[PDB]
Design a protein around this ligand. Structure first.
Ligand SMILES: Nc1ncnc2c1ncn2[C@@H]1O[C@@H]2COP(=O)(O)O[C@@H]3[C@H](O)[C@@H](COP(=O)(O)O[C@H]2[C@H]1O)O[C@H]3n1cnc2c(N)ncnc21
Ligand SMILES: Nc1ncnc2c1ncn2[C@@H]1O[C@@H]2COP(=O)(O)O[C@@H]3[C@H](O)[C@@H](COP(=O)(O)O[C@H]2[C@H]1O)O[C@H]3n1cnc2c(N)ncnc21
Ligand SMILES: Nc1ncnc2c1ncn2[C@@H]1O[C@@H]2COP(=O)(O)O[C@@H]3[C@H](O)[C@@H](COP(=O)(O)O[C@H]2[C@H]1O)O[C@H]3n1cnc2c(N)ncnc21
Ligand SMILES: Nc1ncnc2c1ncn2[C@@H]1O[C@@H]2COP(=O)(O)O[C@@H]3[C@H](O)[C@@H](COP(=O)(O)O[C@H]2[C@H]1O)O[C@H]3n1cnc2c(N)ncnc21
Ligand SMILES: [Mg+2]
Ligand SMILES: [Mg+2]
Ligand SMILES: [Mg+2]
Ligand SMILES: [Mg+2]
Ligand SMILES: [Zn+2]
Ligand SMILES: [Zn+2]
Ligand SMILES: [Zn+2]
Ligand SMILES: [Zn+2]
Lengths: 353, 368, 354, 369
């Protein structure tokens, strides 16, 4: 059946220029430098024996359809037609699935030495299709009190973070009323970054970003493969179980045994420990995958706490904390270098029952 | 000056939506008139004085080069041209190419019928837990599945001040056995008399097992999976499923326990601590991992491994089977779906009790 | 005096809408008087504390009273009133996004055939009121009754079908605060079916009824019009079945009521001049509900027995009638409608309540 | 026939730099983070009689700098109104234009009445959607000079399960009010301070609104708001005088004491004695019970004053609990509850309509000291 040139344009657009029965790109001639004969390379016909009910078919598939004198089909195709348009519509609207909340969490120290502006995260976000729609959240961990970073302090940190987060996640939108994605970067001490991960978890639409010394908030290399994560099991024994992460750098054994005498060391590392190893986000996912496989191995060995000494990039420390948010909880005692005690590893954070 | 033919192509290959915000540029939904209110924007400008303009660029080349032309809404167009540094050529080119490819994939995906989208999530975690609706619909579409609406999304009430107490599990049961059945009954007709069910869950393990039991009679059940790295996308369609190793239970008269060590190794100490004298049968994989649900074949291999073992274990004793599971959420659903009718023993589901220092304690009873 | 970048002047002037943050005076008076603006003379930018989001816009009078330092920075801290001032402007400027809405047209098979309502007609009327759809409008028709007629199962399926569609109202949240969108609904069907539409949507959400008007289509005939008095005659004391007659679009002949409900004790709500055209604006619908609910409370106090409804009311009022009867409290209402295959005699077609 | 730069700068100032038709912020690009003026000054009536909304009798020369003829629009809204002149007629646009400008002025001229925590509490026990928009509460607050550091707390009760409003249901209600709400107010603690004000609107089970008010009644500077079928969160009529609150006292005797509240509607006394045999009935009513009677906050305060007096009177008349049978608007249920925090410590048993028992009154929550 015949159509005007205006209807042709509408049907061609709503189908993205593919045959609805076979999927062939009917703009091929244009791609091969030739002139586009819209009327020749495609036929339009009703889906059932309004531009919404008109299909775009290639000549081949069209000739296979039984039609009556007026060009209408004999068999109903509205099912496959509406389903086709729905698939195109879902792909065409995909950018509105990038609504996102910018979150920059820094210690008061790095907020001074190395402040991360919102513009820098928004540019990295924008490049990945994540679209902020309001002011980015920028917050700094509470300056500790007289009792130090004890339980009440860390519980307040978590309440604070989860409060600001939950208020922004109310900003539902897009095609389906989904909460926005969380785009989070962290630049603080390793225990605080772990509590940031305790706060956000890993069971929502959330994308970690990484502050890189060279490339800043842009990913150094999207193509890089993640390094292999090498595991050294602990020696048999009775001493305290110590998990050593040598990722940014090699942790000296002496520093661990000094802080934790008798420690039996289990170690996760990479071939060349380096500060620049977070080449892309897959590296962070690969780290968590390897870590969790080994944490399960270690937890099957002992019901006793695991003492963590970590030289890890900031992004990895967040994912670590986020990993340990299942219902199941094993006790993890996190150690960090006390800059006021000759950089001695001292216990700073407890996670678990 | 882009010619008329190329502008049409741009409108065609983008399906008439803005490539940066996804809004529909073929229609004004406020007042209801079909209208083309989008703009064919140049990434590299015609003249070198424009935004992203550079000296080494033959402008006569890319004036009709669709790789350099984006369909944008007027607002997104104005924004990129007023902040060239914020929207560099390379970022716009990637976004431009990623957008066009998503439309190609959808146009070339063969039709696979209709299905009701069903998301089931809990609030028993100490963090947000929220499965995006778009990501389920997108996973469905990648397999040719569509729906007449965005589907059903059930969020369990959160634990009250007493943790996961009797009230809580009563709310869970009502959510799965009443609320869900109501939501599906309201779709009856629109989808027909026996519609396919595209289900994904991230909730308490015993709740997901109950969910699988209640939907296990339904044919055309397509389980999807939330994955920490890939969200609802299958991590690797070509991945080979892991082998499932079964340790049969020792002989005796103690209580029979089925331990599933898939996401992690369940410490045997925790099982006997909760069920002294337990005769432990175990299903496990060589490298227990949260990441293991690489594709639906993995899920199907899990149920095939376990269909048989449930029959063997049930043919040993008449008493209840105590379940201790560290398993991914999709396999918790699949496990419950085996209890629907294939296996009508009584199964007592233990779970980690945060009120008891992570000890295993009994929760739901799944009987016939 | 704080030195202004000339461009920071336009940022601050814009974010405050050109009023003094202390006295509320509109500082664009000279432009209103046909003269050129002196943006640096009619107002003094001043940081709120002793980025451009921390700069207030005072007038000269208020600026002096704010004892400044040499360069301008104030003495007392006005950071709270400033941020509260900006919050109030942002609330008002973003108010158009409070109009996000779902269009819903609901018709019977018959009226969809003789008097179809296209989405375009509802959308234009919504737009005039600041209600803006963001997706295709819902347009549905009540299913045709099966062999059992319109029995309880039929009507529950009507309700399920409507409330399934309304899941868009619940879920497609958006805007500045994540609110569910408004529902904009118009119905044109038999009165029993329209009452079930009202039963489905309720009256406890942001929801705006529209009315199809013979002359004015979906546009309101007269926004100024005063709602009519809803006149009420109580029923005669007695034991007969209590009948509520609504003579709004037309006078309902009492003989048709008693013919169908022998011994009917008639209570009547009407207007002085029953008219098809009486729905002149939305306030008329609200006024009808208010008067209706006052009288239903009176009638339910008179008797525990069911109330038999014989309504001659515009379609929009029938929706609101059904929406009113969605509290936890339920009294039994038996809705009667004229059956064409029985000489247009009133016949019981719907039961609401326990 | 071009608009000059001064007029455009006024248009930008008038509107606070937002699109008058969709409310998007036109002074900033939140995606990439750069301040930028990405808005347009759109003419309602065009200079040429052939343009969109063009009229032959329009003096184009005398309106190109008429700000009543100019709207600040985002680029998309401007494109749409010029391609569908029939869908966006001048009357419609002028009306929306003036409405937009007025709300700006009101905000700019409203005095600072301080800060308050927005609190919305709604149930799901109705057979319809039940949803109080956050924007409407925030706009009610702003109209009285109240702002908030964020959009506040919104609590939605779990819906009833297959057995109706049973023991599990009322336990969930108790957890929502006494635990979930309390946890969120604490967590908010810090942004607001020690003793912040609560701007509260409720639309939930009568017994749950009463529990709510009792729970929050300690807190000073509570600002009650009301959801209204016609006016939503707007007050129907600030000038309306409160109605008379008629009270009839109970008869003497040893039977259980019942307080019937006929405000929203007349509570039939036959239903009270059906549920509570031998009831001695006291009734507080208004001359014309109506769902719409909450015309302004003074109506709410007059109900509170009247009821305070009668609770004192009734509490000196029975040793057993006072049984409440209430057909009252949601805001008055909250204020009733707030009288039970400390001023009235007798035990109150709240009855409510039971849709599983054919609309009979049934006992629900017990409220006490
Ligand atoms: N033997 C050993 N040798 C070297 N380091 C060792 C160690 N034993 C322990 N460590 C500690 O392991 C962490 C590795 O350093 P990193 O940079 O890879 O990751 C850090 C970390 O995640 C967090 C807190 O920093 P810090 O407290 O210095 O902890 C350091 C370091 O002291 O912030 C990250 N971070 C700091 N500054 C950054 C910057 N400029 N850019 C990007 N990320 C930056
Ligand atoms: N000794 C032991 N060691 C480790 N775990 C042990 C254990 N003994 C029991 N367990 C339990 O095994 C489950 C493993 O986690 P999982 O992710 O593989 O599977 C979960 C599960 O299917 C369901 C409920 O979660 P939870 O109650 O935390 O159960 C946990 C844990 O408590 O949701 C899944 N789920 C959680 N978070 C998810 C996320 N972010 N993305 C995708 N799915 C996610
Ligand atoms: N002379 C008379 N004496 C006594 N009772 C008379 C009567 N004449 C009509 N009645 C009865 O009074 C009900 C109200 O009539 P109405 O038109 O004011 O409202 C109707 C109603 O709400 C619903 C179903 O229509 P119907 O079944 O005819 O109901 C009539 C009829 O039972 O649709 C509305 N509706 C119909 N057509 C419409 C249109 N074209 N435009 C807008 N709304 C239209
Ligand atoms: N004989 C009798 N006759 C009439 N009612 C009777 C009765 N015996 C008891 N009652 C009860 O008196 C309350 C009157 O209704 P109301 O609106 O005046 O007050 C309600 C109430 O405060 C709370 C819970 O509602 P509900 O449980 O339905 O209680 C109803 C009703 O069952 O929410 C308010 N509320 C409901 N819907 C609302 C809306 N749409 N807009 C604004 N507020 C709304
Ligand atoms: Mg351009
Ligand atoms: Mg334009
Ligand atoms: Mg432009
Ligand atoms: Mg214009
Ligand atoms: Zn084909
Ligand atoms: Zn756009
Ligand atoms: Zn002033
Ligand atoms: Zn706009």
């Amino acid at each position: 059946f015949n159509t005007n040139d205006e209807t042709k344009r509408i049907v061609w657009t709503q189908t993205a220029g593919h045959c609805e029965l076979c999927g062939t790109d009917l703009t091929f001639d244009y791609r091969a430098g030739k002139p586009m004969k819209w009327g020749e390379v495609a036929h339009i016909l009703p889906a059932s024996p309004d531009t919404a009910n008109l299909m775009l078919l290639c000549p081949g598939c069209h000739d296979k359809i039984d039609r009556d004198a007026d060009g209408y089909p004999e068999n109903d195709l509205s099912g496959l037609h509406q389903a086709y348009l729905e698939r195109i519509r879902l792909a065409a609207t995909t950018p509105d699935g990038g609504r996102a909340i910018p979150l920059i969490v820094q210690s008061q120290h790095f907020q001074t030495i190395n402040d991360i502006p919102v513009r820098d995260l928004l540019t990295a976000m924008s490049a990945e299709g994540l679209t902020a729609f309001d002011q980015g959240i920028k917050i700094a961990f509470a300056a500790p009190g007289p009792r130090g970073r004890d339980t009440t302090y860390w519980q307040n940190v978590k309440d604070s973070v989860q409060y600001e987060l939950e208020q922004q996640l109310k900003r539902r939108g897009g095609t389906y009323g989904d909460s926005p994605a969380l785009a989070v970067v962290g630049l603080a001490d390793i225990p605080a970054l772990m509590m940031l991960g305790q706060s956000i978890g890993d069971r929502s639409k959330r994308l970690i970003f990484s502050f890189h010394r060279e490339h800043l908030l842009r990913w150094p290399d999207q193509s890089a493969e993640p390094p292999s994560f090498l595991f050294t099991p602990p020696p048999n024994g009775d001493g305290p179980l110590a998990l050593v992460l040598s990722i940014s750098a090699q942790v000296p054994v002496r520093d661990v045994t000094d802080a934790l005498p008798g420690a039996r060391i289990a170690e996760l590392s990479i071939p060349e420990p380096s500060y620049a190893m977070v080449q892309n986000r897959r590296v962070i996912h690969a780290f968590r995958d390897a870590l969790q496989i080994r944490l399960s191995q270690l937890e099957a060995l002992t019901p006793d706490p695991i003492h963590v000494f970590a030289a890890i990039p900031a992004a990895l420390a967040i994912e670590f904390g986020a990993l340990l948010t299942t219902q199941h909880q094993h006790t993890y005692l996190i150690f960090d270098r006390d800059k006021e005690n000759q950089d001695r590893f001292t216990q700073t954070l407890q996670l678990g029952p």
